[PDB]
């Protein structure tokens with residue numbers, strides 16, 4: 610908070626969490642470890658699965674649109 614390094618953009622191929630490349634081929638695996646697989650959200654966003662988890666441990670939300678995503682467990686119910 611209160612600290613920026615000019616980084617303030619929106620991407621569809623980059624995990625804003627760490628600003629690392631995030632995308633995958635339809636029949637090839639751009640990333641070896643499945644830990645950072647392109648996990649897509651219900652709202653329509655994609656973040657590295659590991660980074661998404663790291664963020665959700667502190668705030669279960671989309672750090673992009675701020676919408677209320679599913680619980681840290683991945684399956685909210687009421």
Ligand SMILES: [Zn+2]
Nearest residue numbers: 624626657660
């Ligand atoms: Zn990431």
Ligand SMILES: [Zn+2]
Nearest residue numbers: 652654671674
């Ligand atoms: Zn979202």
